[PDB]
Structures are given as structure tokens and as C-alpha cells.
């Protein structure tokens, strides 16, 4: 199966350079071109450029001067590099592959890399429990969660019970606090009768700071 | 560059209904247009290529038509999982360019929130900050009101809200309201109350606790 897996999200200081690795499988970089696209709040989807089967590159006009794309066919890696970033280069960057070798209809996408351009410092979150209780239990359904607080930059991933628990899960969009740090809660509703027999764990992963926390959440 | 104009910005329909998305081009581009779907936290998914040609793995309810400057993406009978943004793309002219997208929302019957309140953990209190969380779960429509009160004092400016996107299965929203106090302020008070107002409730729901 065709897949594209990109390197993880991160901070880039203003006027510095961005590097992303796209590792592909289920096809050969000798047979297909690989494209780069980004998605920003202000400009939405922008096609950035492509490296072709035979090593030739095209760059969208505004980026010709600060963009370089390279690959290692044998390693199945494509290397994206953009210079002198400003805050409006903050975007999700994707690598992508078309249906046919010469075309631009993107049937296959990487998972995207959120690049934040900022002067600030990377900071891991503290994870606090949102304990279930009577004030959190109605009609045999209990709510519980994790407060994922004071991190930077976006994103964090949150799962429950190492991925085994997905139904009833709501992970809220992060909000920027006045401190300039993000905060977020993730909740899940479960049968109140299971609070005695099942463990509930939010698996928190903040890749930009390499902070992984497993937080057990128990009734109080 | 070719400018692509998508209209309208938001579509809202009920399930089972047919819906169309419009994508207009600044000059003719033949049938060289592709369509994508973007769900919450997803990468784009290719739905239609070359205006009308189907894509393997994509539901038959998706189709497209048009030529020249005026294009249409249709879904003949909308499902809850169709909640997403939709983008068009032209490649008749270099460089390839994308429209700004259209949002598809789903209508459903009114659902009252379930309300839960969570005091700050003793863990967080050790750090000198207190977060009180109020959760409104699985409601429709999105409009809700959350009023915080500490010992009968209306709280203002010290809470932030977050709302999920529509659930792809039941079309509801969930909302969290978080009240943040210094540990010092938090210890100087007793009754913490979250009051919720929603079209689906026949009177406001209050969830509260006394510290300790």
C-alpha cells in the first residue's frame, strides 16, 4: 500500500530554516515524483514544488530562492528544506504523490507536519487528572479526563488506553493562554460500573519537546 | 495564477439530502479540476479527478461535473461522515492552485448537553494554579451559554472555552469551559458553580461543588 510518513512537528526560530523528511513506501522514488504542499491560515493550500523521478525540481515562483528539495532513492526519502522563515510560514506542510508519474492529482498524502515559526522556547505540558465523581456521574455514565496544560508549540496527541479506548473520547482544540502557552482537555465518558475494574490512562505525546506522559485517572 | 472561487463558504444540510459545491475559475481551465475532502485533523483526500472521473475507494454518492469556468461537486445523499471541508484544485495552468474551500455542516434534532464539573486536582494545586473544568457533552446545536459563579460572585474574563467540531457519527458538539484561578484565590472561596443554558434544556442546569 502506498504510504508517505513525514518527520515530526516542531518550532523554527524566525529567519531560520525548515527541514522535513518524507519517507515513502509501496512505490519507488525512481518511478514517481513527490510533491510538497502547505496549508496556512492566511493562504490556505499552496503547492510549493516537486522532485521528479529523475531528480529534476520545480519550485512555485515565490519560493524558488529559498526552497530546496532532494532525495535518496535507495533510502526512499525525500528531503524538504526552506530558508529564512517568517511567522506567516507557520503552516502544516505535506508531502504528496499523484496517481500517475507526471501528473498533479494527489491521491496520496503524508500526515502533515505542523511547523510553528516563533521566537519562543519549546515547552512540554503538565498533565493533570480530571477525576470522575458524583458531580461527574449521571445515569450510570461517568465522565473523566486529562488536563494537558502549559505547552508550546502545538500539537499534542492524546489517546486513551494506548489506543484501545476511542468511543466517547473528545479531545478539545487547544486554546492559547495569556502566557503564550497552549492548554487543552481530553475527556471520555464510560460506564460508572467500570471505574472499579478498568484502568483509565490518557497517553499524552508532545513531540516538539519529546515529552510523553501516561496519566492514570482515578475516581476521587 | 488561476484564481479559484468556492461558494458558498458554509453549507448546512440535513442527512439524506443532496448537496452541491460550486467552484469557479478566473479563466477557462477545461475539465482540469480535482476535488478533495478534509475531515477534522486529516490530510486532504482525493474525491474526484478531471471534473467527473471517479476515484477508487470513494463512495458512489460523490460525483462532479462542469467544464470551462463553472464546476460542481455533488453528494446525492449526505451522511454524518461527510462533515468536512471541501476543496477544488485546477491544473490547466502552472502553478496548480487551490480554492479556499467550503464547509459542510449537518443539521440534526436538538440534543441537550450532559453537564459535568471537575474541581482542580490536588496535583495541579501543588503547582500554584487551579483549573476548574466544566464539560457540556454531546449537544446540538452549537450555541450554548456557560456562566461561572464563585460564592455567588459572577466570574468574568477568567475562563476559556473550546468547542469540538461536529461528531462524524452523531453530529453533536462538545464544549469545555475552563475557569482559571490562582491557588491563593481558589483557597479563599467555597462554592464553585457552572451554569449551563441551551435550547434543549427547559431550564438552566447548574453543576457545582464546595472546595473539599
Amino acid at each position: 500500500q502506498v504510504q508517505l510518513k513525514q518527520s515530526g512537528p516542531g518550532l523554527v526560530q524566525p529567519s531560520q530554516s525548515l527541514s522535513i523528511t518524507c519517507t515513502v513506501s509501496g512505490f519507488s522514488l525512481t518511478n514517481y515524483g513527490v510533491h510538497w504542499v502547505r496549508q496556512s491560515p492566511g493562504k490556505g493550500l499552496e503547492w510549493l514544488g516537486v522532485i521528479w523521478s529523475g531528480g529534476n525540481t520545480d519550485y512555485n515562483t515565490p519560493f524558488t530562492s529559498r526552497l530546496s528539495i532532494n532525495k535518496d532513492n535507495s533510502k526512499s526519502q525525500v528531503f524538504f528544506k526552506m530558508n529564512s522563515l517568517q511567522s506567516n510560514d507557520t503552516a502544516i506542510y505535506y508531502c504528496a504523490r499523484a496517481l500517475t508519474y507526471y501528473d498533479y492529482e494527489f491521491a496520496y498524502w503524508g500526515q502533515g507536519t505542523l511547523v510553528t515559526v516563533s521566537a519562543a522556547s519549546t515547552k512540554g505540558p503538565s498533565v493533570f487528572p480530571l477525576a470522575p465523581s458524583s458531580k461527574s456521574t449521571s445515569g450510570g455514565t461517568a465522565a473523566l479526563g486529562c488536563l494537558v496544560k502549559d505547552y508550546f508549540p502545538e500539537p499534542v496527541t492524546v489517546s486513551w488506553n494506548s489506543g484501545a479506548l476511542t468511543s466517547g473520547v473528545h479531545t478539545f482544540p487547544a486554546v492559547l493562554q495569556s502566557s503564550g502557552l497552549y492548554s487543552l482537555s481530553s475527556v471520555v465518558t464510560v460506564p460508572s460500573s467500570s471505574l472499579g475494574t478498568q484502568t483509565y490512562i490518557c497517553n499524552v505525546n508532545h513531540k516538539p519537546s519529546n515529552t510523553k506522559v501516561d496519566k492514570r485517572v482515578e475516581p476521587k | 495564477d488561476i484564481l479559484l472561487t468556492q461558494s458558498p463558504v458554509i453549507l448546512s444540510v440535513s442527512p439524506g439530502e443532496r448537496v452541491s459545491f460550486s467552484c469557479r475559475a478566473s479563466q477557462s481551465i477545461g475539465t482540469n479540476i480535482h476535488w478533495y475532502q478534509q475531515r477534522t485533523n486529516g490530510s486532504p483526500r482525493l474525491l474526484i479527478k478531471y471534473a467527473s472521473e471517479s476515484i477508487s475507494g470513494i463512495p458512489s454518492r460523490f460525483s462532479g461535473s462542469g467544464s470551462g469556468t463553472d464546476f460542481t461537486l455533488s453528494i446525492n445523499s449526505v451522511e454524518s461522515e461527510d462533515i468536512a471541508d471541501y476543496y477544488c484544485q485546477q491544473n490547466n495552468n502552472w502553478p496548480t492552485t487551490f480554492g479556499a474551500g467550503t464547509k459542510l455542516e449537518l443539521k440534526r434534532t436538538v440534543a441537550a448537553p450532559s453537564v459535568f464539573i471537575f474541581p482542580p486536582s490536588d496535583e495541579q494545586l501543588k503547582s500554584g494554579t487551579a483549573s476548574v473544568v466544566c464539560l457540556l457533552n454531546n449537544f446540538y446545536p452549537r450555541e450554548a451559554k456557560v456562566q461561572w459563579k464563585v460564592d455567588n460572585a459572577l466570574q468574568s474574563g477568567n475562563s476559556q472555552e473550546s468547542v469540538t467540531e461536529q461528531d462524524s457519527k452523531d453530529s453533536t458538539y462538545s464544549l469545555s469551559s475552563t475557569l482559571t484561578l490562582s491557588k491563593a484565590d481558589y483557597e479563599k472561596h467555597k462554592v464553585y458553580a457552572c451554569e449551563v443554558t441551551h435550547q434543549g434544556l427547559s431550564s438552566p442546569v447548574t453543576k457545582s461543588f464546595n472546595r473539599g
Partner: peptide
Amino acid sequence: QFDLSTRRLK
């Protein structure tokens, strides 16, 4: 406008 947190238009 595209939101980087959710990847949805807001």
C-alpha cells in the same frame, strides 16, 4: 480561515 489546531475552516 484554516485552523492549524483542527485542520478545519473556522
